[PDB]
Paper text:
Mammalian DNA methylation patterns are mainly generated by two de novo DNA methyltransferases, DNMT3A and DNMT3B5. The catalytically inactive DNMT3-like protein (DNMT3L) has an important regulatory role in this process by acting as cofactor of DNMT3A or DNMT3B6–8. In addition to CpG methylation, DNMT3A and DNMT3B introduce non-CpG methylation (mainly CpA) in oocytes, embryonic stem (ES) cells, and neural cells. For simplification, we choose the DNMT3B–CGA complex for structural analysis, unless indicated otherwise. Similar to the DNMT3A–DNMT3L complexes, the DNMT3B–DNMT3L–DNA complex reveals a linear heterotetrameric arrangement of DNMT3L–DNMT3B–DNMT3B–DNMT3L.
To gain a mechanistic understanding of the enzymatic divergence between DNMT3A and DNMT3B, we generated the complexes of DNMT3B–DNMT3L, formed by the MTase domain of human DNMT3B and the C-terminal domain of human DNMT3L, with two different Zebularine (Z)-containing DNA duplexes harboring two ZpGpA or ZpGpT sites as mimics of CGA and CGT motifs, which are separated by 14 bps. The structures of the DNMT3B–DNMT3L–CGA DNA (DNMT3B–CGA) and DNMT3B–DNMT3L–CGT DNA (DNMT3B–CGT) bound to the cofactor product S-Adenosyl-L-homocysteine (SAH) were both solved at 3.0 Å resolution. The two structures are very similar, with a root-mean-square deviation (RMSD) of 0.27 Å over 828 Cα atoms. Accordingly, the TRD loops of DNMT3B and DNMT3A adopt distinct side-chain conformations for CpG recognition: In the DNMT3A–CGT complex, R836 donates a hydrogen bond to the Gua6-O6 atom, whereas the corresponding residue K777 in DNMT3B points toward the +1 flanking nucleotide; instead, in the DNMT3B–CpG complexes the Gua6-O6 atom receives a hydrogen bond from N779, unlike the corresponding N838 in the DNMT3A–CGT complex that does not make any base-specific contact with the CpG site. To analyze the effect of K777 on the substrate preference of DNMT3B, we measured the enzymatic activities of DNMT3B–DNMT3L WT and mutants on hemimethylated DNAs containing unmethylated (GTC)12 or (GAC)12 on one strand while methylated (GAmC)12 or (GTmC)12 on the complimentary strand, referred to as CGT and CGA DNAs, respectively. WT DNMT3B shows a ~2-fold preference for CGA DNA over CGT DNA; in contrast, the K777A mutant shows increased methylation for both CGT and CGA DNA, but with preference for CGT over CGA, which likely arises from the altered base-stacking interaction between the +1 base and the CpG guanine.
Numbering used by the authors:
A (entry chain C), B (entry chain B): 179 to 351, 360 to 379
C (entry chain D), D (entry chain A): 563 to 853
The structure:
Amino acid sequence: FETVPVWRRQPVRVLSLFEDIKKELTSLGFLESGSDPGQLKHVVDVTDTVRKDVEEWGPFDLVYGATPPLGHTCDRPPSWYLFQFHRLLQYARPKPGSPRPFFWMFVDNLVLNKEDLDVASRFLEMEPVTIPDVHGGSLQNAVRVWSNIPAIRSRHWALVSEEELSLLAQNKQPTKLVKNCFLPLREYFKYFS
Amino acid sequence: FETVPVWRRQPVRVLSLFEDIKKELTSLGFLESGSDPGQLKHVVDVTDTVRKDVEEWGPFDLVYGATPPLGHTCDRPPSWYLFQFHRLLQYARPKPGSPRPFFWMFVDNLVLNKEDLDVASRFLEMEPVTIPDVHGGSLQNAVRVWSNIPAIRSRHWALVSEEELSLLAQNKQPTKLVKNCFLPLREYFKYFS
Amino acid sequence: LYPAIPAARRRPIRVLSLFDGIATGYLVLKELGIKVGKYVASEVCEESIAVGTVKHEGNIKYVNDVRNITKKNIEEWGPFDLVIGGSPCNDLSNVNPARKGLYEGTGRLFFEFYHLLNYSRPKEGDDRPFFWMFENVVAMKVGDKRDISRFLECNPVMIDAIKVSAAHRARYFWGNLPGMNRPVIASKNDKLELQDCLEYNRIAKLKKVQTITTKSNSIKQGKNQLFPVVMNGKEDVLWCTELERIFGFPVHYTDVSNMGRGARQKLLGRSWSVPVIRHLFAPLKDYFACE
Amino acid sequence: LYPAIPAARRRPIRVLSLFDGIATGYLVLKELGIKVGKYVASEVCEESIAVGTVKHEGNIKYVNDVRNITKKNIEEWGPFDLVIGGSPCNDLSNVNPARKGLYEGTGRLFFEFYHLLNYSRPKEGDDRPFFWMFENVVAMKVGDKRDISRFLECNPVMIDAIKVSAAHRARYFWGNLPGMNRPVIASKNDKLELQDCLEYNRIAKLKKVQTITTKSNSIKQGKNQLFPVVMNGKEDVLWCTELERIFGFPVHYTDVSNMGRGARQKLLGRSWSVPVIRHLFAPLKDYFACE
DNA sequence: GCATGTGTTCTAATTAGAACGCATG
DNA sequence: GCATGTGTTCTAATTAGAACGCATG
Ligand SMILES: Nc1ncnc2c1ncn2[C@@H]1O[C@H](CSCC[C@H](N)C(=O)O)[C@@H](O)[C@H]1O
Ligand SMILES: Nc1ncnc2c1ncn2[C@@H]1O[C@H](CSCC[C@H](N)C(=O)O)[C@@H](O)[C@H]1O
Ligand SMILES: [Mg+2]
Ligand SMILES: [Mg+2]
């Protein structure tokens, strides 16, 4: 996916699953003012969603997948979120000919066990990248990311062992880390400000 | 076997094995005190005797078999005396047309066990008759007899309790016993005195 | 419906069999007369692989555990004209009170079939024929049957082996095979009654037996748990050769690897009813070569 | 030695088989082509009887423990044209260090064969044909072999299964069959090498195997106690169908009565080498009807 | 309106495997 | 000169058998 000239960058059309990212996405300038429903589509329960739904929901430029933030509030098994995410991604991908760039991503909030992680890498065809947000005095933020964004897997993030990540599993309870995670997307779509 | 008149009774031709009863047959008068060379053949080891040996030894009117009396003289397995007796017995049988009376008898001096005794009756086609040979004051002698002599099987002898005579075996640790069962042979053959 | 294929343009069939078991798929395809060009089997049970290799003389390419089949494997081993399989049902069937659904335990393995199926699918613009099938038990949670139908974008056809065999075997069958919803009919050689499956000098107490599982208890019928057979005036369980004839497998098909009674029943108890699979694979001989 | 019989005069054979085992004698006679008029078998092992009944479809009359057969039975069930038997060798074979000999334990069952053979013998003046055979192990006390020869009034010819099979099996064979001392020659359908007996994808380490007993240790060859087969680069023991082929029995002959590895080896371990018995019964074709 | 089930389990019977044995060509 | 055997046996694995389970026509 080559870079796009600034004057041809159309607004992004995203599909956000299990988690609403409208607030996090608008903050970095991806969705224009309001009452335009084309920019985002959000579904929380997908057990009854068919391909014809996502097809008619309008072609998408980004498909976002996310697990529940770490807390004892999941009726669903942790593996359920990926299998369903992989299910509709095949529904949302356009024809083999490429009219525009198509991206996708899946974040884990330290919810999947090692068995769920290797199944995750197998189904998303890549081993994940880890996003740490520590300034020494803070331990706060950490997520695992599977994505086809070239810049999500381009630079060299702060390599941290995850014997230290289970120490971060406080389990009792985004702006800096997740926005940094998303910035390389606006080099492909409209900058709204 | 019908009775034979007195003037047609030849002397016996006896095959005696494992035990010499020459003294018993001479005493009751089946055997001439003067005879040449003899009318009684005696073998103790029949393991290497063949049919043509018994056929060579002249026609036999009686074939006698006997286990060794109670003691340490039991060189061979107890069943050995029976199988070898039955083996030689078929050798001594004459042509199907019987020219004279053929008799056979096998005696056990309470040496064979129950497993051996039912094997005994199976091969000799007859359940044994026990000789009490016990005076009111003296319970000395006791034997088991398989024989085709009619009088051995014909008449009632004193019934006995096996449970009491099962213990008689190790209390040891002759005429009434065995030679009284020899007497009825006299009528078919010659009486010498 | 796929277009009909002329008899001269037909090529042998290329099959990807996941959770192959004892190669029931290859067996029915061969017994139908269909030429089998390639049969790629994913199976982890040692005794199961032993049955497939020995009874079919190495015509089956075994590609061990399915979760290690990559994308590159599919197009290297492919293309595939047929993708079949039945995932383990120990965490899905109602015979197990400790089942874990299809998102935990061994129920996840269904998604491996789903994952590898879309790999094998001909890409857009390739109108070549492509058929697939997935089998599983009826006695699963409605949520499980719902989600399986969602991922396969298809609703299952239930076919009970009671109509073509001597045993109760109700199973769901997702797929796109031609005419799966048609009424199934018995053949001449279909052993329809337990007496037809027994050996000489054996009497059958029933016409049909309850569902065969891996365990020896499913052979004693009903709540009584009576023995299904009498011979020499003595009640007896079914025999390995009789279990084979009940499932429609060739006699002594599982006389492999010094397997005993329990081992052979374990492989058969989880297998497919041969005449049911024959009914499903039968319309394929109009799309591939036959000799 | 035996008067020839014209073909029209030939009538089917009537056989008394003592210690029949798995009905090897019947199998050989039938495979030769001889019409079997009657086959009276004395056997006490249930699994052994199960084999003979199922594999031969009830043509075999089982009577029972040999010690319950009477002289009346022999004349009722007879007349017999052939009397064959192999006495149990657990108390006669040198492989048992605690063997009890010919006169105690199981060795005394030989005298039952001797007893019933003379019962079945044609009486004096009966020129009609009559054949018999008795088999037992070579590794037998000198006194026992002497006494057996004494009771049978005959000396044994030794035939080793190695000449016609893929295994060491040296056995004595008393009898009066025509040409028992003739040179044993192999047939074109004899599996002379272990590799001929194995299944697909199995490598034979040896050309010939040591004597097969009832126990699984006789499969481990030599003092090394090595496995005789390699499969997929892994050492392995023989299979039940492979033992059957080693012995010359039809494949799956002992797939009966839910028997496992040990049970099937036990029956085969005591059995006869089929090609050896075929060599012995072959001249009977010139005395009885054949179709 | 009760009976059924592509199985987990735990115990109780099972066998599996190798030690044992030595007269002998 | 030394490896072999139509088995008995004792022990260590190993499997057989039934208890257990309940939503659903
Ligand atoms: N991870 C895995 N990869 C490949 N096969 C697996 C597997 N896990 C289990 N299996 C196999 O999948 C099979 C499911 S049972 C189905 C057997 C087959 N349908 C037949 O006709 O016999 C089992 O034999 C099991 O051994
Ligand atoms: N008392 C008895 N009566 C009849 N058969 C007996 C017996 N005791 C043992 N047997 C049987 O005698 C057989 C000796 S093994 C011989 C088997 C046979 N020759 C074959 O070809 O297979 C064994 O099967 C054993 O079960
Ligand atoms: Mg369908
Ligand atoms: Mg001879």
